[PDB]
């Protein structure tokens, strides 16, 4: 019993090519270049899925430090006081209160200040 390659090799190829669309040049038309670029893309995606955390942490931290420096202290003093006050509150992100409702942010500044020392 013989079995040619048949549909198979095309189907598989087509599948990979389906992801390739959007890419520049042969890299999206040719199966081979498509495969390679898809590999690199997969790895980049996996890595940046961890990068996203660091990036957002940093952005938040900058904003927090800015609005905190509006009141008189720096981010280091802020977190020292806040963690010393007992408020394990606010996954740093939720200090977005710098933007909306900055009054709450100010009361938090005080509660950190007095409990700092």
């Amino acid at each position: 019993p013989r079995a040619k390659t048949g549909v198979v090799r095309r189907r598989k190829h087509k599948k990979i090519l389906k992801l390739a669309k959007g890419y520049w040049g042969l890299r999206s038309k040719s199966f081979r270049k498509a495969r390679e670029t898809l590999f690199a893309a997969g790895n980049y995606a996996y890595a940046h899925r961890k990068r996203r955390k660091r990036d957002f942490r940093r952005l938040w931290i900058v904003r927090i430090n800015a609005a905190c420096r509006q009141h008189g202290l720096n981010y280091s003093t802020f977190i020292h006081g806040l963690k010393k006050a007992g408020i394990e509150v606010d996954r740093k992100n939720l200090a977005d209160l710098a933007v909306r409702e900055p009054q709450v942010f100010a009361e938090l500044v005080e509660r950190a200040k007095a409990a700092q020392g």
């Binding site: 007992g86 408020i87 394990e88 509150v89 709450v104 509660r111």
Partner: protein
Amino acid sequence: MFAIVKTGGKQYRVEPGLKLRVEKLDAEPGATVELPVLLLGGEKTVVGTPVVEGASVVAEVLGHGRGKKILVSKFKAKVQYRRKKGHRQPYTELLIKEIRG
């Protein structure tokens, strides 16, 4: 009134009555689940001792569901190593109601 709940190992801000996507919570498909985890308030309620000792927030478990598929794809060149996984981090959509803290 503004509110900070900490569930699924993560802290979300919450308005009185709004649809929210949270980590899967083992409960009825459509009953009520208070989140005793709650921080702050609309008219300011700084949570000195980590959790506010006298507040809460009520929500309805709207429904369970699966997240859209995310392909993970490890590949280390020169040594023909390739791995491909599909993934769908499940979740429950909470519907928030009363803010009786």
